[model samples]
Target: RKTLEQRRGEYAYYVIKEVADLNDKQLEEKYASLVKKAPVMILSNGLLQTLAFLLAKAETSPEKANQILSRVNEYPPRFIEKLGNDKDEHLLLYLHIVYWLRENVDRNIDVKTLLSQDYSKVLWATKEAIALLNWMRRFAVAMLKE
Candidate 1:
């Protein structure tokens, strides 16, 4: 006898080694390409709701938003794959957010410039941008935590 499905909770300890091998630019390119794919999956339902409030703030800075997406990119494929298979969600939403912003940013629309000590501004924001930014903010901490 054999099991068709993987064991439960199998990815809790998983760590993807590929991220460590990539340079910063490589990682950015990968994330950028990933966004173009627009693949949506969820790993944590609770995380989605929890991060909803900070989307606007996160979109305020490209540096900050990319940082969050970078962290998400660091997750091992095995872990993400398992989460996707078991949890029925896309893990790339934050990555997509940053990349979308990356495409939108320009000479006059620098995401990094949006933040400052006294204020933050995100011009021409759409409803999707609003949600994605908050989502990135909410998960930024999660990205660093072990």
Candidate 2:
């Protein structure tokens, strides 16, 4: 089995590679910039709020958001199909993060379910999300254009 750190790097690279393969200059720049800022945003505003903002942005500029979400849907531990055609952008992003966190952190917890649980669980999830985001940020800076 792959170590957690190796899985993190692989997943992060997968996301970045999806963006790079899109071959859209504007989208590449947008995704790279967003990935660059995501960890800090999570630190400042928290994961839920940052994801909310991302969902809001998806409404105005869907291509960028779709690029990330679609890739997440296909990555290991994928869960979008089970979500059906909900079209709720916030939930989509929220569950995407939750699914990743579930795979990496705790299999039994999810973001929505964790909301009513202890603050420590939420805090742990946020930190893990930031860890994964940091890997993505590093890959984005190295492989993508500004």
Question: lDDT: which candidate is best?
Answer: 2
lDDT (10s digit) by residue, model 1, range 1-146: 12211211112112212222333344434433432333232223222332232344223334444444444544233223322222211233343443444434322223333432122224333333454544333333233222
lDDT scores in order? 0.33, 0.65
TM-score of 2: 0.70
The CA-based lDDT of model 1 is what? 0.33
Candidate 2, run of 10 with poorest lDDT? 80-89
TM-score of 1: 0.24
- Candidate 1 local lDDT, residue 130: 52
Best by TM-score: 2
What are the RMSD figures for all models against the true structure?
A: 15.4, 6.0
Q: What local lDDT does model 1 show for residue 112?
A: 37
Give per-model TM-scores.
0.24, 0.70
Candidate 1: misplaced stretches above 4 Å?
Answer: 1-91, 106-113, 117-121, 127-146
